[PDB]
Coordinates of N, CA and C in Angstrom, one line a residue:
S1 N 1.1 -1.8 0.1 CA -0.3 -0.1 0.0 C 0.3 1.4 0.1
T2 N 0.5 2.1 -1.0 CA 1.3 3.9 -1.0 C 0.7 4.5 0.4
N3 N 1.8 5.9 0.8 CA 0.1 6.7 0.8 C -0.1 7.9 0.2
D4 N -1.2 8.8 0.4 CA -1.8 9.5 -0.6 C -0.9 10.6 -1.4
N5 N 0.2 11.3 -1.1 CA 1.2 12.0 -1.3 C 2.2 11.2 -2.3
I6 N 2.2 10.0 -3.1 CA 3.0 9.0 -3.9 C 1.8 8.5 -4.7
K7 N 0.1 8.8 -4.3 CA -0.6 8.6 -4.8 C -0.6 9.9 -6.6
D8 N -1.1 11.1 -5.9 CA -0.6 12.0 -6.4 C 0.3 11.8 -7.1
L9 N 1.3 12.2 -7.0 CA 2.6 11.5 -8.2 C 2.7 10.7 -8.5
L10 N 2.5 9.5 -8.5 CA 2.1 8.9 -9.5 C 0.5 9.2 -10.6
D11 N -0.4 10.3 -10.3 CA -1.2 10.2 -11.6 C -0.5 11.3 -12.2
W12 N 0.0 12.5 -11.6 CA 0.8 13.2 -12.3 C 2.2 12.9 -12.9
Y13 N 2.8 12.0 -12.6 CA 3.7 12.5 -14.0 C 3.5 10.9 -14.6
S14 N 2.4 10.2 -14.8 CA 1.7 9.1 -15.4 C 0.9 10.1 -16.5
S15 N 0.3 11.2 -16.7 CA -0.4 11.5 -17.5 C 0.6 12.4 -18.5
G16 N 0.3 12.9 -19.1 CA 1.4 13.2 -20.5 C 2.2 14.5 -20.2
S17 N 2.6 14.7 -21.2 CA 2.7 16.9 -21.2 C 2.2 17.0 -22.6
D18 N 2.0 18.3 -22.8 CA 1.7 18.6 -23.7 C 3.2 19.7 -24.7
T19 N 2.7 19.0 -25.6 CA 3.7 19.7 -26.7 C 3.0 21.0 -28.1
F20 N 3.6 22.5 -28.3 CA 3.1 23.2 -28.9 C 4.7 23.5 -29.1
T21 N 5.0 23.4 -31.0 CA 6.2 23.8 -31.5 C 6.0 25.3 -32.1
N22 N 6.4 27.0 -32.7 CA 6.6 28.0 -33.0 C 4.7 28.5 -32.3
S23 N 4.8 28.5 -31.0 CA 3.8 29.5 -30.5 C 4.2 31.0 -30.7
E24 N 3.0 31.7 -30.5 CA 3.1 33.5 -30.4 C 2.6 33.8 -28.9
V25 N 3.5 35.0 -28.9 CA 2.8 35.2 -26.9 C 2.5 36.4 -27.9
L26 N 1.3 36.5 -26.8 CA 0.1 36.9 -27.1 C 0.2 38.6 -26.1
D27 N 0.8 38.7 -24.7 CA 1.3 38.5 -23.7 C 2.1 38.7 -22.1
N28 N 2.2 38.9 -22.0 CA 3.5 38.8 -20.2 C 3.0 39.3 -20.0
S29 N 3.1 39.3 -18.5 CA 3.0 39.6 -17.3 C 3.9 39.0 -16.5
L30 N 3.7 39.9 -15.1 CA 4.5 38.9 -14.5 C 3.6 37.8 -13.5
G31 N 4.6 36.7 -13.9 CA 4.0 35.4 -13.0 C 2.9 35.0 -14.3
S32 N 3.2 35.1 -15.7 CA 1.8 34.8 -16.3 C 2.4 35.0 -18.4
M33 N 1.9 34.2 -18.8 CA 1.9 34.5 -20.1 C 1.0 34.2 -20.9
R34 N 0.1 34.6 -21.9 CA -0.9 34.3 -22.8 C -0.2 34.0 -24.3
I35 N -0.4 32.7 -24.6 CA 0.1 32.6 -26.0 C -0.6 31.9 -27.2
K36 N -1.0 32.2 -28.3 CA -1.7 31.4 -29.1 C -0.5 30.2 -30.2
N37 N -1.0 29.3 -30.3 CA -1.3 28.2 -30.3 C -1.3 28.0 -32.4
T38 N -0.4 27.2 -32.8 CA -0.5 27.2 -34.4 C -1.8 26.9 -34.6
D39 N -2.2 25.8 -33.7 CA -3.7 25.1 -34.0 C -4.7 25.8 -33.4
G40 N -4.8 27.4 -33.6 CA -5.6 28.1 -32.8 C -6.5 28.2 -31.9
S41 N -5.5 27.2 -30.6 CA -6.0 27.4 -29.2 C -4.7 28.7 -28.6
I42 N -5.3 28.7 -27.5 CA -4.5 29.5 -26.6 C -4.3 28.9 -25.3
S43 N -2.4 29.3 -24.7 CA -2.4 29.4 -23.8 C -2.4 29.7 -22.7
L44 N -2.7 29.2 -21.5 CA -2.1 30.5 -20.8 C -1.4 29.6 -19.6
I45 N -0.3 30.1 -19.3 CA 0.3 29.3 -18.4 C 1.0 30.4 -17.4
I46 N 1.1 29.4 -16.1 CA 2.0 30.3 -14.8 C 3.2 29.9 -14.3
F47 N 4.2 31.0 -14.0 CA 5.3 31.3 -13.8 C 5.6 31.5 -12.5
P48 N 5.0 30.8 -11.4 CA 6.2 30.9 -10.1 C 7.4 31.3 -10.0
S49 N 8.4 30.7 -10.3 CA 9.6 30.7 -9.4 C 10.7 32.8 -9.9
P50 N 10.7 33.9 -9.7 CA 11.4 34.3 -9.5 C 12.6 34.3 -10.4
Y51 N 13.6 33.4 -10.5 CA 14.3 32.6 -11.0 C 14.7 32.5 -12.6
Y52 N 12.7 32.1 -13.0 CA 13.1 31.2 -14.7 C 11.4 32.8 -14.6
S53 N 11.2 33.2 -14.8 CA 11.0 34.5 -15.3 C 10.7 35.2 -17.2
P54 N 9.7 33.7 -17.8 CA 10.1 34.3 -19.1 C 10.3 35.7 -19.3
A55 N 11.2 36.4 -20.7 CA 10.8 37.6 -20.6 C 10.6 37.7 -22.3
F56 N 10.2 36.9 -23.0 CA 9.8 36.8 -23.9 C 8.8 38.3 -24.6
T57 N 8.4 38.8 -25.3 CA 8.0 40.5 -26.0 C 7.0 39.6 -26.3
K58 N 5.9 40.3 -27.1 CA 4.5 40.2 -28.1 C 4.8 39.8 -29.0
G59 N 4.8 39.2 -29.4 CA 5.3 39.0 -31.1 C 5.9 37.5 -31.6
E60 N 7.2 37.3 -30.0 CA 7.7 36.3 -30.5 C 7.2 34.7 -30.5
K61 N 8.0 34.0 -31.0 CA 7.4 32.6 -30.8 C 8.0 32.1 -30.3
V62 N 7.4 30.7 -29.7 CA 8.2 30.0 -28.1 C 7.7 29.0 -28.6
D63 N 8.2 27.5 -27.9 CA 8.4 26.5 -27.5 C 7.5 26.0 -26.1
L64 N 6.4 24.6 -26.8 CA 6.0 24.7 -24.9 C 5.9 23.2 -25.0
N65 N 6.1 22.6 -23.6 CA 6.8 21.5 -23.3 C 6.8 21.5 -21.7
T66 N 5.1 21.5 -22.1 CA 4.7 22.0 -20.6 C 3.5 20.6 -19.6
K67 N 3.0 21.2 -19.2 CA 1.4 20.4 -18.0 C 1.2 21.4 -17.7
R68 N -0.3 20.6 -17.6 CA -1.5 21.0 -17.5 C -1.4 21.3 -16.0
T69 N -2.4 21.9 -16.0 CA -2.7 22.2 -14.6 C -4.2 21.4 -14.1
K70 N -5.3 21.7 -14.9 CA -6.8 21.8 -15.4 C -7.1 21.5 -16.4
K71 N -8.1 20.9 -16.7 CA -9.3 20.5 -18.0 C -9.5 21.5 -19.0
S72 N -9.0 21.2 -20.1 CA -9.1 22.8 -20.9 C -10.4 23.1 -21.0
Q73 N -10.4 24.9 -21.5 CA -12.0 25.0 -21.7 C -12.5 25.9 -23.1
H74 N -13.7 25.3 -23.5 CA -14.3 26.1 -24.6 C -14.6 27.2 -24.0
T75 N -14.8 28.5 -24.5 CA -15.5 30.0 -23.8 C -16.1 30.6 -24.8
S76 N -17.2 31.7 -24.5 CA -18.3 31.9 -25.0 C -18.1 32.0 -26.2
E77 N -16.8 33.0 -26.1 CA -16.1 33.3 -27.9 C -16.1 32.5 -28.6
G78 N -16.1 31.0 -28.0 CA -15.3 29.8 -28.6 C -14.0 29.8 -29.1
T79 N -13.1 30.1 -28.0 CA -11.8 30.1 -27.9 C -11.4 28.7 -27.1
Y80 N -10.8 28.2 -27.2 CA -10.4 26.8 -26.6 C -8.7 27.6 -26.0
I81 N -9.2 27.0 -24.0 CA -7.9 27.8 -23.6 C -7.6 26.8 -22.6
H82 N -5.9 26.6 -22.7 CA -5.0 25.1 -22.3 C -4.8 26.1 -20.8
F83 N -4.4 25.4 -19.3 CA -3.9 26.0 -18.5 C -2.5 25.6 -18.6
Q84 N -1.3 26.2 -18.2 CA -0.8 25.2 -17.6 C 0.0 25.8 -16.7
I85 N 1.1 24.7 -16.7 CA 2.6 25.9 -15.6 C 3.7 26.1 -16.3
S86 N 5.3 25.8 -16.4 CA 6.2 26.1 -15.9 C 6.0 25.9 -18.3
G87 N 8.0 25.3 -18.9 CA 8.0 25.3 -20.0 C 7.5 26.1 -21.1
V88 N 8.3 27.2 -21.5 CA 8.2 27.9 -22.0 C 9.7 28.0 -22.6
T89 N 10.3 27.9 -24.2 CA 11.4 28.3 -24.1 C 11.7 28.6 -25.6
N90 N 12.3 28.8 -26.1 CA 13.0 29.5 -27.1 C 12.5 28.4 -28.5
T91 N 12.9 28.7 -29.9 CA 13.0 27.6 -30.7 C 14.1 27.3 -31.4
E92 N 15.0 27.5 -31.1 CA 16.2 26.8 -31.2 C 16.5 25.0 -31.1
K93 N 16.5 25.0 -32.3 CA 16.4 23.3 -33.2 C 18.9 22.8 -32.4
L94 N 18.9 21.6 -32.3 CA 20.7 21.4 -32.3 C 20.1 21.2 -33.5
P95 N 22.0 20.7 -34.2 CA 22.3 19.8 -35.9 C 21.3 19.2 -35.9
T96 N 22.0 18.3 -34.8 CA 20.9 16.8 -35.2 C 20.8 16.1 -33.8
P97 N 19.2 15.3 -33.9 CA 18.9 15.0 -32.4 C 19.9 14.3 -31.4
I98 N 20.2 14.7 -30.3 CA 21.2 14.4 -29.4 C 20.5 13.1 -28.2
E99 N 20.7 12.0 -28.0 CA 20.3 10.9 -26.8 C 21.1 11.6 -25.6
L100 N 20.2 11.6 -24.5 CA 20.8 12.5 -23.5 C 21.1 11.4 -22.5
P101 N 22.3 11.0 -21.6 CA 22.7 10.2 -20.9 C 22.1 10.4 -19.8
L102 N 20.8 8.6 -19.7 CA 20.5 8.6 -18.9 C 20.8 7.2 -17.8
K103 N 21.2 7.5 -16.8 CA 21.8 5.6 -16.0 C 21.0 5.6 -14.9
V104 N 19.9 4.8 -14.7 CA 18.8 4.5 -13.6 C 19.1 3.4 -12.6
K105 N 19.5 3.7 -11.6 CA 19.5 2.7 -10.3 C 18.0 2.0 -9.5
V106 N 18.0 1.3 -9.7 CA 16.6 1.0 -8.8 C 17.3 -0.1 -8.0
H107 N 17.4 0.3 -5.8 CA 17.7 -0.4 -5.5 C 19.5 -0.6 -5.2
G108 N 20.0 0.2 -6.4 CA 21.4 0.0 -6.2 C 21.8 -1.5 -7.5
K109 N 20.5 -1.6 -7.9 CA 21.2 -2.3 -9.1 C 20.8 -2.0 -10.4
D110 N 21.5 -1.8 -11.9 CA 21.3 -1.7 -12.9 C 20.2 -1.8 -13.6
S111 N 19.7 -0.8 -13.8 CA 17.6 -0.7 -14.3 C 18.3 -0.5 -16.5
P112 N 17.6 -0.7 -17.2 CA 18.1 -0.5 -18.3 C 17.3 0.0 -18.6
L113 N 17.3 1.1 -19.6 CA 15.7 1.9 -20.5 C 15.4 1.6 -21.6
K114 N 14.1 1.4 -21.9 CA 13.1 1.8 -22.7 C 12.4 2.8 -23.1
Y115 N 12.7 2.5 -24.4 CA 11.5 4.4 -25.1 C 11.9 5.5 -24.5
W116 N 12.8 6.0 -24.2 CA 13.5 7.0 -23.9 C 14.5 7.6 -25.4
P117 N 13.8 8.9 -24.9 CA 14.1 9.8 -27.0 C 15.1 10.5 -26.9
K118 N 14.9 10.7 -28.0 CA 16.6 12.0 -28.4 C 15.6 13.1 -28.4
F119 N 16.1 13.6 -28.4 CA 16.2 15.7 -28.3 C 16.3 16.2 -29.3
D120 N 15.4 17.2 -29.8 CA 16.6 17.5 -31.1 C 16.3 19.3 -30.7
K121 N 16.1 19.6 -29.8 CA 16.1 21.5 -29.2 C 17.1 21.5 -28.1
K122 N 17.6 23.1 -28.3 CA 18.6 23.6 -27.5 C 18.6 23.2 -26.0
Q123 N 17.4 24.1 -26.1 CA 17.6 24.2 -24.3 C 15.8 23.8 -24.0
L124 N 15.7 23.1 -22.5 CA 14.4 22.7 -22.6 C 14.5 22.9 -21.0
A125 N 13.0 23.3 -19.9 CA 12.8 23.8 -18.9 C 13.3 22.5 -18.2
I126 N 13.8 22.7 -16.9 CA 13.5 21.9 -16.5 C 13.0 21.2 -16.1
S127 N 12.0 21.9 -15.4 CA 10.2 21.2 -15.0 C 10.2 20.3 -16.4
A128 N 10.3 20.5 -17.2 CA 10.4 18.8 -18.5 C 10.9 18.2 -18.6
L129 N 12.3 18.7 -18.2 CA 13.4 18.0 -17.9 C 13.1 16.3 -17.3
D130 N 12.7 17.4 -15.8 CA 12.0 16.6 -14.5 C 10.7 15.3 -15.2
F131 N 9.7 16.4 -16.2 CA 8.6 15.0 -16.6 C 9.6 14.1 -17.5
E132 N 10.7 13.9 -18.4 CA 10.2 13.0 -19.2 C 11.3 12.2 -17.8
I133 N 12.4 12.3 -17.0 CA 13.0 11.4 -16.5 C 11.9 10.5 -15.6
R134 N 11.4 11.7 -15.0 CA 9.9 11.1 -13.9 C 8.9 10.0 -14.3
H135 N 8.7 10.0 -15.6 CA 7.9 9.7 -16.2 C 8.5 8.3 -17.2
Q136 N 9.8 8.2 -17.3 CA 9.8 6.6 -18.1 C 10.4 5.8 -16.6
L137 N 10.3 6.4 -16.0 CA 10.1 5.8 -14.5 C 8.9 5.1 -13.5
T138 N 8.3 6.6 -13.8 CA 6.7 4.9 -13.7 C 6.2 4.2 -14.4
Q139 N 6.8 4.2 -16.1 CA 6.8 3.3 -17.3 C 7.2 2.7 -16.7
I140 N 8.5 2.9 -17.3 CA 8.9 1.2 -17.6 C 9.3 0.8 -16.2
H141 N 10.4 1.4 -14.4 CA 11.1 1.2 -13.5 C 9.7 0.8 -12.9
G142 N 8.7 1.0 -12.7 CA 7.8 1.0 -11.1 C 7.9 1.8 -10.6
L143 N 8.3 3.3 -10.5 CA 8.1 4.4 -9.5 C 6.8 4.9 -9.5
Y144 N 6.3 5.1 -7.7 CA 5.0 5.1 -7.9 C 4.3 4.4 -7.2
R145 N 4.1 2.8 -8.5 CA 3.0 2.1 -8.4 C 3.9 1.0 -7.2
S146 N 4.3 1.2 -6.1 CA 4.2 -0.2 -5.2 C 4.8 0.8 -4.0
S147 N 4.6 -0.2 -2.8 CA 5.5 1.2 -1.2 C 7.1 0.9 -1.7
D148 N 7.6 0.3 -2.1 CA 9.1 0.2 -2.4 C 10.0 0.3 -3.0
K149 N 9.2 1.5 -3.7 CA 9.6 2.2 -4.9 C 8.7 4.3 -5.1
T150 N 9.0 4.7 -4.1 CA 8.8 5.4 -3.4 C 9.5 7.1 -3.0
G151 N 11.4 7.0 -3.6 CA 11.5 8.0 -3.6 C 13.0 7.8 -4.3
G152 N 13.8 8.5 -3.8 CA 15.6 8.5 -4.6 C 15.5 10.4 -5.7
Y153 N 15.9 10.1 -6.1 CA 16.1 11.6 -6.9 C 16.8 11.9 -7.8
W154 N 16.3 12.3 -8.6 CA 17.6 12.9 -10.2 C 19.1 14.0 -10.1
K155 N 19.9 14.2 -10.5 CA 20.7 14.5 -10.6 C 21.4 14.6 -12.3
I156 N 21.9 16.5 -12.2 CA 22.3 16.2 -13.6 C 23.8 16.9 -13.6
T157 N 24.4 16.3 -13.9 CA 25.4 17.0 -13.9 C 26.0 17.7 -15.2
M158 N 26.2 18.9 -15.4 CA 26.2 20.1 -16.4 C 28.6 19.7 -16.3
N159 N 28.9 20.1 -17.8 CA 30.2 19.6 -18.7 C 31.3 21.2 -17.3
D160 N 30.1 22.0 -16.9 CA 31.4 23.1 -15.4 C 31.2 22.3 -14.6
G161 N 30.5 21.0 -14.2 CA 30.7 20.9 -12.4 C 29.2 21.3 -12.0
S162 N 28.8 22.2 -12.5 CA 27.3 22.6 -11.4 C 26.4 21.4 -12.0
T163 N 25.6 21.6 -10.2 CA 24.5 20.5 -10.7 C 23.4 21.0 -10.7
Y164 N 21.9 19.5 -10.8 CA 20.3 20.4 -11.1 C 20.0 19.2 -9.8
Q165 N 19.0 19.2 -9.0 CA 19.0 17.9 -8.7 C 17.3 18.1 -8.1
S166 N 16.8 16.8 -8.0 CA 15.2 16.9 -7.5 C 15.3 15.5 -6.4
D167 N 14.1 15.6 -5.8 CA 13.8 15.0 -4.4 C 12.6 14.0 -5.0
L168 N 12.5 12.6 -5.6 CA 11.4 11.6 -5.9 C 10.2 11.6 -5.2
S169 N 10.1 12.2 -4.2 CA 9.7 11.7 -2.9 C 8.4 13.3 -2.7
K170 N 8.7 14.8 -3.4 CA 8.0 15.9 -3.7 C 8.2 15.9 -4.8
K171 N 6.5 17.2 -5.2 CA 6.9 17.0 -6.7 C 7.5 18.2 -7.1
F172 N 7.7 18.2 -8.3 CA 8.7 19.4 -8.6 C 8.5 20.6 -8.0
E173 N 9.8 21.7 -7.0 CA 9.4 22.4 -7.0 C 9.5 24.0 -7.8
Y174 N 8.2 24.1 -8.3 CA 8.1 24.9 -9.6 C 8.9 25.8 -8.9
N175 N 8.2 26.3 -8.1 CA 8.4 28.0 -7.0 C 10.1 28.1 -6.8
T176 N 10.6 27.3 -7.6 CA 12.4 28.2 -7.2 C 12.7 27.4 -8.8
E177 N 11.5 27.5 -10.0 CA 12.9 26.4 -10.7 C 13.9 27.7 -11.0
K178 N 14.8 27.4 -11.5 CA 16.2 28.2 -11.9 C 15.8 28.2 -13.6
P179 N 16.5 28.6 -14.5 CA 16.4 28.6 -15.8 C 16.4 28.0 -16.8
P180 N 15.7 27.7 -18.3 CA 15.9 26.8 -18.7 C 17.2 26.4 -18.8
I181 N 17.8 24.7 -19.7 CA 19.4 25.1 -20.1 C 19.6 24.4 -21.4
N182 N 21.4 24.4 -21.7 CA 20.9 23.8 -22.7 C 21.8 23.2 -23.1
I183 N 20.8 21.4 -23.0 CA 21.1 20.3 -23.1 C 22.3 19.5 -23.3
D184 N 22.8 20.4 -24.9 CA 24.4 19.6 -24.8 C 25.4 20.6 -24.5
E185 N 24.8 20.5 -23.0 CA 25.9 21.2 -22.0 C 25.8 19.8 -20.7
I186 N 25.3 19.2 -20.8 CA 24.6 18.1 -19.6 C 25.3 17.0 -19.8
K187 N 26.5 16.8 -18.4 CA 27.4 15.4 -19.3 C 27.1 14.3 -18.6
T188 N 26.3 14.2 -17.7 CA 25.5 12.8 -17.3 C 24.1 13.4 -16.5
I189 N 23.3 12.2 -16.3 CA 22.2 12.0 -15.3 C 21.9 10.7 -14.7
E190 N 21.6 11.1 -13.8 CA 22.0 10.0 -13.2 C 20.2 9.8 -12.4
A191 N 19.5 9.1 -12.0 CA 18.4 8.7 -11.3 C 18.3 7.1 -10.5
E192 N 18.2 7.8 -10.0 CA 17.9 6.4 -8.1 C 16.6 5.8 -7.2
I193 N 16.6 5.1 -7.3 CA 14.9 4.8 -7.1 C 15.4 4.1 -6.0
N194 N 15.2 4.7 -4.5 CA 15.4 4.0 -3.8 C 14.5 2.3 -2.8

């Protein structure tokens, strides 16, 4: 049996993420952005962190690799609105897609990856990297599904030695999220399930 916190995390990381490329900025105020997607929908995205406050101005193009906070709505005016959190980056692509070095250990023993995607974007928000890492863990490695896989961490080590890390027993700390990083500067990503 697992506790209620672990159940919320299983629901959160087992659903998917929203992906929109080449969207256009309509408005950008403190803590949010109103974006128009190519398919005609509108995205209302919140940015709770003072360290990651997108500075894109009206008219600029951006990419979305984000998560919805609630069900989308059809309004009176007939617009389709998405409610998402974080995940806005520039539209730059890498010369050729790369494979991010992810090594996973479950109870100290190595656990091989299955369906770990390649990435063609130059920069990804840290919350998006968090979603991808944890999603692979819940779908392929059993994270949050039983009581013996409820904690651990993931750690990204950059070429200069600086690191980013998240505790798997808690939801990603959106309120203190750091700015998006260039994925081609990541030396290693390790994930351990206790």
